[PDB]
């Protein structure tokens, strides 16, 4: 049995924006898991959540 592509009509899309203060990051993503985006972004930036 073969696989399957999701083929969501909206492709992977995101806009990440630094606030300019205390390394704050606002991350606007087409995702199913905002908490996971928060974890992996903060971990990559060595920042608290």
């Amino acid at each position: 049995m073969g696989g399957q592509e999701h083929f969501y009509m909206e492709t992977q899309s995101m806009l990440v924006v630094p606030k300019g203060e205390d390394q704050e990051m606002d991350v606007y993503v087409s995702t199913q898991f905002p908490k996971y985006i928060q974890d992996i972004v903060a971990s990559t930036l060595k920042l608290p959540a």
Binding site: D39, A42, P48, A49
Partner: protein, 49 residues
């Protein structure tokens, strides 16, 4: 200061002391209500507003 004012005509020193009772209070109880929202994320960090 009074010794200075006795020895000088075109220049005068002055001294004064005032007391303070600044009462603190709004007109009603509803005017003094306040609210907040605190989050604790799974890494231990806290966001407060």
């Amino acid at each position: 200061v009074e010794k200075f004012n006795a020895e000088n005509y075109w220049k005068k020193k002055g001294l004064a002391m005032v007391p303070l009772k600044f009462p603190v209070g709004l007109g009603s109880r509803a005017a003094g209500q306040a609210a907040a929202l605190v989050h604790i994320y799974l890494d231990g960090s806290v966001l407060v507003t």
